[PDB]
Amino acid sequence: LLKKSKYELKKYNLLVENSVGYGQLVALLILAYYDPDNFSKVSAYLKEIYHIMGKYSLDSIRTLDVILNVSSQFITEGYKFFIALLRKSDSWPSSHVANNSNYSSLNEGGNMIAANIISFNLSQYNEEVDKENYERYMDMCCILLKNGFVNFYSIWDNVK
Amino acid sequence: EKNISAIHDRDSLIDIILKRFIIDSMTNAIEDEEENNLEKGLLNSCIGLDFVYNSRFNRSNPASWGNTFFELFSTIIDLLNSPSTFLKFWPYAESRIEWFKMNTSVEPVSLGESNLISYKQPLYEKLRHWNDILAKLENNDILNTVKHYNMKYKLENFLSELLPINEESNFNRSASISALQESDNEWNRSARERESNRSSDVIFAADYNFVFYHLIICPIEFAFSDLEYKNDVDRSLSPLLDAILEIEENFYSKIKMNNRTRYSLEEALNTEYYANYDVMTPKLPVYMKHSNAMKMDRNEFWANLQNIKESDDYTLRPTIMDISLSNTTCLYKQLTQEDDDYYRKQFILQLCFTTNLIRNLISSDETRNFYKSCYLRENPLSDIDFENLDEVNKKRGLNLCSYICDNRVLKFYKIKDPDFYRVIRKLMSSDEKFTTAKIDGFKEFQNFRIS
Amino acid sequence: EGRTYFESLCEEEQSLQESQTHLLNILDILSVLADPRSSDDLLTESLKKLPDLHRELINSSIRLRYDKYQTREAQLLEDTKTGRDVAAGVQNPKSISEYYSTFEHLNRDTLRYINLLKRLSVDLAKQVEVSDPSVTVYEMDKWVPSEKLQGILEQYCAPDTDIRGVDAQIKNYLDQIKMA
Amino acid sequence: MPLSQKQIDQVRTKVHYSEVDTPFNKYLDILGKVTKLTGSIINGTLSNDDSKIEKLTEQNISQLKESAHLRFLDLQSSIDTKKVADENWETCQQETLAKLENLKDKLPDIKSIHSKLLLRIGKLQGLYDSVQVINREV
Incomplete structure (x- = not known):
């Protein structure tokens, strides 16, 4: 009890622990892709996402996962809103945004928390709803390596 | 140099010199105007902190610089006299986030790893103190502004990326389901009367609260319960979902009878081939695509509505997706009229998250043995019982779980809109990948290798 | 009696200064015991002052600990009061219960505006118009209608324009084709 | 190896x-x-043992005099830091209760937009009933 109520951060990983908090974050990204004005309103949604992520004490390592799992179902039509929303965020690498177009800059990269989530999500292929959505998730990941969001050898070394 | 009697550990003295220099410079704000005396006090502290990091090779030890640097940074967060002056300082913290992780090491860590443990010296007394600041903003649940929550998000996101992802105080180890989740306003609640229940929409709204207060708040109380406690939900939940899912039958038929009776009048007008295509989004109709006068009508409305919701007079407002529970006049008006279709898509996302746990709790056996050690380690003389199979109980949970989602939710959305149905099936599939990861102890996130 | 956290914390600094003075008065006596060129009379005089200060230091370091405990119980007493008890002092409920109600009616109709731009979005019946025989292919995504039909539809969404007057202007355009 | 109800609330x-x-x-x-x-110099024990702090020095006893003065200022500044941090939280709790108190001059700004945004739905639902009737004939 000394390390549960005095050292443990009060944040909620799973989608069942705070079902009101993740029920609003999901229904916001459904709205953000059914809106014809999504380039004047990048910070009109990015100031809303940071207001549900702090009212309800949601985790940042899971909110990055829920963002990358609703975005990959709308990646055909809206794929330039998904990068424009994610370039202004506080999860975009600001100082270590190093690119995958050099031969020595394939090691030095940025955002090793999203290098843990995609390498965990591409290494699972043992279900029958996970198989019908692996192609569209692999396209969404391949846009992120181009813009410099993640490294190459962070994803290459940690897939099955 | 004029004094010669620094016979002590001089690095203990220089910390006190650096501590008093921050305290008076943060309080002295009477020399000029208050807004521009702030950045004269804030700046003298920021050069004081960078003075510690650069002059870290010249002190007595390499390891001692980490405890001075966490001491001075924790002092500044007390003297910041507002949430508004905390947000304008906080870009100093998010930029030098690689300075915190290199604890007791003069050469920096590479990227990704951190030399920080939750029960060791720099975080032994600071993590207990920074959780007290976060408990203050959380307990104050009726006088919180939008600058308060932004203070709360940027502070817990500072600590989540400070500690490793496989760290015992970092992944919600004992899985605590939240009970303070109340998307509700205090000032619209009118006495919660249960006496004059003449209209049917009251106990509609009241048992909507009860299916919220007893399923979604607590799924571990629902599964390990009696056979009559599951009987008053099902006789009330089935009038609820068959009044909601008959509205989206009438909302999606508005879209279908719009375009098909245009295409049948296009098959009547133009006869070229069998014009039978898939129903997709009517993107921007014919004329709103290239209309710079129609565009500036809308693009100036999203500039007025953003300036209202940003100034320091409107900082007391609910979220945009907030579904009000106490106000029974606003709750019935959000779910019934067929033009929002987001306040009743919040209920289906809320329902399919707990119902997914009702299946995995009753059926599996390592899941029930995990929640043994979660309740019995914190409350050893507990109240509810779980101890064995309960074969008379297993037949009722799985027959209400598989009916309410697999037989009414997931077979309705596969016909109406097959893009939203692909989000529910992926979100429920991703939850069991992480629940199984928590039971193990998040130790597949430990083998992540850095080149 | 009931004390506040602010008053109990400021009283701790008063008892802290009393412990400092007896601490410094003892420490200089130990210094003059350790002088190398020390005199015979000062080592006899200083030791007589010693037991009177020793039991005085204990009575000050005990009250320091006793006021470290009384501020800890006053700290926790003010945290249980926070929340909905501080805002139970306002005397204007009708002004706030209509301010939150006119904001909850605002976001409900902002979603209805977005749900009328892309997701319902009624369009024209695209009737093909072909004049040049040198293109030989047509795409039904860049069909732009007639300017007499566009300028009527342009000014309808434009402001300060009646709902019943332009209905005849539609009927002006509708019956114009019905003659021809 | 059981516990009691008294034995749980003693660790709670x-x-x-x-x-x-x-x-x-x-x-x-x-x-x-x-x-x-x-205590020991009153009794009489003073030897070359390392169980206590030190025996007799000029420099290192004055080093204890420096340690007695350094940690006093560290404690004095920390009580002052808890003083100002409690004063600031009481001010923002009062000015938020002041901003919640009046709430009368900021009400006419919302009802302008909500009567303007309810006007903009009146045109589009009339525009989508104008284009819907010209397509029904042909």
Whole structure:
């Protein structure tokens, strides 16, 4: 009890622990892709996402996962809103945004928390709803390596 | 140099010199105007902190610089006299986030790893103190502004990326389901009367609260319960979902009878081939695509509505997706009229998250043995019982779980809109990948290798 | 009696200064015991002052600990009061219960505006118009209608324009084709 | 190996009243180090043993005099830091209760937009009933 109520951060990983908090974050990204004005309103949604992520004490390592799992179902039509929303965020690498177009800059990269989530999500292929959505998730990941969001050898070394 | 009697550990003295220099410079704000005396006090502290990091090779030890640097940074967060002056300082913290992780090491860590443990010296007394600041903003649940929550998000996101992802105080180890989740306003609640229940929409709204207060708040109380406690939900939940899912039958038929009776009048007008295509989004109709006068009508409305919701007079407002529970006049008006279709898509996302746990709790056996050690380690003389199979109980949970989602939710959305149905099936599939990861102890996130 | 956290914390600094003075008065006596060129009379005089200060230091370091405990119980007493008890002092409920109600009616109709731009979005019946025989292919995504039909539809969404007057202007355009 | 109801609420209380405080616990190390030192010189024991702090020095006893003055200022500045942090939270709790108190001059700004945004739906639902009737004939 000394390390549960005095050292443990009060944040909620799973989608069942705070079902009101993740029920609003999901229904916001459904709205953000059914809106014809999504380039004047990048910070009109990015100031809303940071207001549900702090009212309800949601985790940042899971909110990055829920963002990358609703975005990959709308990646055909809206794929330039998904990068424009994610370039202004506080999860975009600001100082270590190093690119995958050099031969020595394939090691030095940025955002090793999203290098843990995609390498965990591409290494699972043992279900029958996970198989019908692996192609569209692999396209969404391949846009992120181009813009410099993640490294190459962070994803290459940690897939099955 | 004029004094010669620094016979002590001089690095203990220089910390006190650096501590008093921050305290008076943060309080002295009477020399000029208050807004521009702030950045004269804030700046003298920021050069004081960078003075510690650069002059870290010249002190007595390499390891001692980490405890001075966490001491001075924790002092500044007390003297910041507002949430508004905390947000304008906080870009100093998010930029030098690689300075915190290199604890007791003069050469920096590479990227990704951190030399920080939750029960060791720099975080032994600071993590207990920074959780007290976060408990203050959380307990104050009726006088919180939008600058308060932004203070709360940027502070817990500072600590989540400070500690490793496989760290015992970092992944919600004992899985605590939240009970303070109340998307509700205090000032619209009118006495919660249960006496004059003449209209049917009251106990509609009241048992909507009860299916919220007893399923979604607590799924571990629902599964390990009696056979009559599951009987008053099902006789009330089935009038609820068959009044909601008959509205989206009438909302999606508005879209279908719009375009098909245009295409049948296009098959009547133009006869070229069998014009039978898939129903997709009517993107921007014919004329709103290239209309710079129609565009500036809308693009100036999203500039007025953003300036209202940003100034320091409107900082007391609910979220945009907030579904009000106490106000029974606003709750019935959000779910019934067929033009929002987001306040009743919040209920289906809320329902399919707990119902997914009702299946995995009753059926599996390592899941029930995990929640043994979660309740019995914190409350050893507990109240509810779980101890064995309960074969008379297993037949009722799985027959209400598989009916309410697999037989009414997931077979309705596969016909109406097959893009939203692909989000529910992926979100429920991703939850069991992480629940199984928590039971193990998040130790597949430990083998992540850095080149 | 009931004390506040602010008053109990400021009283701790008063008892802290009393412990400092007896601490410094003892420490200089130990210094003059350790002088190398020390005199015979000062080592006899200083030791007589010693037991009177020793039991005085204990009575000050005990009250320091006793006021470290009384501020800890006053700290926790003010945290249980926070929340909905501080805002139970306002005397204007009708002004706030209509301010939150006119904001909850605002976001409900902002979603209805977005749900009328892309997701319902009624369009024209695209009737093909072909004049040049040198293109030989047509795409039904860049069909732009007639300017007499566009300028009527342009000014309808434009402001300060009646709902019943332009209905005849539609009927002006509708019956114009019905003659021809 | 069972527990009791009394035995659970005795550990539910020790956690709730547990504090770690590095400036305060370091000052009482100095107050403790001198009372055991002036205790033995009253009795008569003074030897070359390392169980106590030190025997007799000019420099290192004055080093204890420096330690008694350094940790006093660290404790004094920390009580002042807890003083100003409590004063600031009471001010923002009062000015938020002042901003919640009036709420009358900011009400006409919302009802302008909500009567303007309800006007913009009146045109589009009339525009989508204008284009819907010209397509129904042909």
